[PDB]
């Protein structure tokens, strides 16, 4: 059996459908900005290290994209504070990110990989902390939005 292979961060790259909650006044607000489900991509770096991948919102929320650290064994990702955004001159901080395989449930009712992480933007004059959470995009037009 031939092994197809992949990049070092393979299992945590992907296409995800996420929604952005926010922690406001101690409580969590389901989609405060009324944004619905949005598309975002994680993927390997040109260096192909098993310790860092890109996180890319595809310009569908804050317009951000940074390199996050990766603990590929644990399927977690984070930054150590506020890191340069590459889409425009800003900084972003990613915390407590993880990729949980087969934990999610698609719109059609199938297991998919969950991605979830906390995020902060240094040019957010309200200074909130947001919870981006979602599932791996399957490919069926019925699991899109």
């Amino acid at each position: 059996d031939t092994e197809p292979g992949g990049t070092a961060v393979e299992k945590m790259a992907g296409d995800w459908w996420v929604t952005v909650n926010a922690f406001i006044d101690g409580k969590e607000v389901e989609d405060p900005f009324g944004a619905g489900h949005l598309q975002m991509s994680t993927y390997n770096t040109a260096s192909n290290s098993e310790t860092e991948m890109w996180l890319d919102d595809l310009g569908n929320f804050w317009e951000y994209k940074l390199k996050v650290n990766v603990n590929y064994a644990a399927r977690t990702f984070s930054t150590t504070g506020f890191v340069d955004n590459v889409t425009y001159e800003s900084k972003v901080k990613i915390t407590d990110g993880k990729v949980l395989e087969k934990a999610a449930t698609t719109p059609s009712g199938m297991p998919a990989d969950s991605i979830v992480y906390m995020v902060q933007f240094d040019d957010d004059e309200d200074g909130l902390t947001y919870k981006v959470s979602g599932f791996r995009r399957t490919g069926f037009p019925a699991d899109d939005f």
């Binding site: 197809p4 393979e10 790259a13 296409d15 994680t42 390997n44």
Partner: peptide
């Protein structure tokens, strides 16, 4: 071809691109 199931077909940067 099995060779195409590479990277689980998740988005990928060609590993030494420029």
């Amino acid at each position: 071809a099995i060779q195409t199931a590479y990277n689980d077909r998740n988005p990928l940067i060609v590993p030494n691109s420029v």
